[PDB]
């Protein structure tokens, strides 16, 4: 149906950050009318749509333009192949209304070591305490999906 909630911008606040730092996004959205159910924003680590990182619920949805901060926990280096700790990965930020995904924003992420010398000379055991992630916020991929909101047809 006609789209009640719309995403307006995303700021990637703490960027670049340590691999193990939480993610902090300021999210702007506009809600045109009272809705019956919750929004769920979630953050998914993709790498490769593998692992859900965190999720925040909003209900009841405030009407109008609103800004909030979404603090999402970082991926665990333990549930990740060492191959992917110092390469390019993807995070997926998405919103659902009543369990129905209507927007999805993808970012590429560069993961690289702290200092030049360590960049040029990777140790065979990966030192996660020295990996700095850098989300490429400048170039998002935005995908929307027409969904049924509160008016059944």
């Amino acid at each position, epitope marked *: 149906g006609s789209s009640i909630v719309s995403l307006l911008g995303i700021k990637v606040l703490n960027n670049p950050a340590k691999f193990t730092d939480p993610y902090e996004f300021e999210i702007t959205f506009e809600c045109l009318e009272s809705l019956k159910h919750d929004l769920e924003w979630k953050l998914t680590y993709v790498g490769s749509h593998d692992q859900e990182l965190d999720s925040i619920l909003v209900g009841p949805v405030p009407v109008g333009v609103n*800004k909030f901060v979404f603090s999402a926990d970082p991926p665990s280096a333990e549930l990740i192949p060492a191959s992917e700790l110092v390469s390019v990965t993807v995070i997926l930020l998405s919103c659902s209304y009543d369990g129905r995904e209507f927007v999805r924003v993808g970012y590429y992420v560069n993961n690289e070591y702290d200092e030049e010398e360590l960049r040029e000379n990777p140790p065979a055991k990966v030192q996660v305490d020295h990996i700095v992630r850098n989300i490429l916020a400048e170039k998002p991929r935005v995908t929307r999906f027409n969904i049924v909101w509160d008016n059944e047809n």
Partner: antibody
Amino acid sequence: EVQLVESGGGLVQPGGSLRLSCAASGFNVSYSSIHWVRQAPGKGLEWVAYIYPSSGYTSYADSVKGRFTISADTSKNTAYLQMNSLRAEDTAVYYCARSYSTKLAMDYWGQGTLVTVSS
Amino acid sequence: DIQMTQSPSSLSASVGDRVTITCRASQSVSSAVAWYQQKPGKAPKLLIYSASSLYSGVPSRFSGSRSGTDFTLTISSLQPEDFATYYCQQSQWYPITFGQGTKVEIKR
């Protein structure tokens, strides 16, 4: 040993201007947000502004929009509050504070510097 | 457009009491609520963050809970160094917001 030191405070006329400094030591300012919070005499806590020095992204309270500017010098590990167009009701103790992996709660606080605006 | 409405404004207690300070949010907040203690002439100190996470260092008698849009600071068994002002704080929505405060005062 984490600590933040304010400086810059003092008396200034209505409509004038003052720069506050927040020198951080013991942690890397880049991997956190730095907040300014103020307290008018005998009043509650009021959030003024923040900055993520890594991105340079910032935010202001409506009461301070377009008069106050917040900035960070990542080499000096230091944050600044440039205050312009001061009104008397900007008179307060100004704390800088740091937020890190605490969903924008503030875990360390400066001693606070006092700012008086008066004719 | 968000409020942290904090109750009560003043609160009388003797040592040993279980005291409860309540903060209601004007709209939904998943977890970014924090509680602070300030003493006269001092910078506030963090007590609990993320609604219920005891900050490191803070005595375990301070705890945080949430019921719906009501966030609560509990001090089971109030000690004498606990007479202070307590502020709640929201940092999910713009703008970050402190409650009005609660002064915890000695009973007589």
